[PDB]
Design a binder for this molecule. Structure first.
Ligand code: ZN
Length: 105
C-alpha cells in the first residue's frame, strides 16, 4: 500500500509517503457549485497528470490557493486539482481519493 495509481487505467500518480496534512488533516471533504461532494486527499507531489488551462481562485477550497483541473495524463479521468499561488506550501495537489487505486510499489 505504497503507491497510488489512476483507478481507470493504471497510470502512476502518487505515493502514500507524499501525503500532506493541510490545516492538520490530509483529508478534506468539499463540494463544488454543482453540489458534487469530493473526498480530497492532499499530496505534496504527484506525477502522470495533465494540468488543464490556467489557474483560478474562484471557489477555491484552500485559502490563498488558485487551482487548475488535474486529469490523468493517460486516460483523461478527472483526478483532482493542482493548487498554486499560496504559502507554506506554495503548491500542492488535491486528489479525489476514490478515483485512485492503492497498491505495491
Ligand atoms: Zn487514468
Amino acid at each position: 500500500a505504497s503507491i497510488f495509481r489512476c483507478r481507470q487505467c493504471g497510470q502512476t500518480i502518487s505515493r502514500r509517503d507524499w501525503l500532506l496534512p493541510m490545516g492538520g488533516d490530509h483529508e478534506h471533504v468539499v463540494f463544488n457549485p454543482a453540489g458534487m461532494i469530493f473526498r480530497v486527499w492532499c499530496f505534496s507531489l504527484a506525477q502522470g497528470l495533465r494540468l488543464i488551462g490556467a489557474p483560478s481562485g474562484e471557489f477555491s477550497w484552500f485559502k490563498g490557493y488558485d487551482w487548475t483541473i488535474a486529469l490523468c495524463g493517460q486516460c483523461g479521468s478527472h483526478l483532482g486539482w493542482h493548487y498554486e499561488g499560496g504559502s507554506q506550501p506554495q503548491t500542492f495537489f488535491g486528489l479525489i481519493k476514490d478515483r485512485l487505486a492503492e497498491g505495491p510499489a
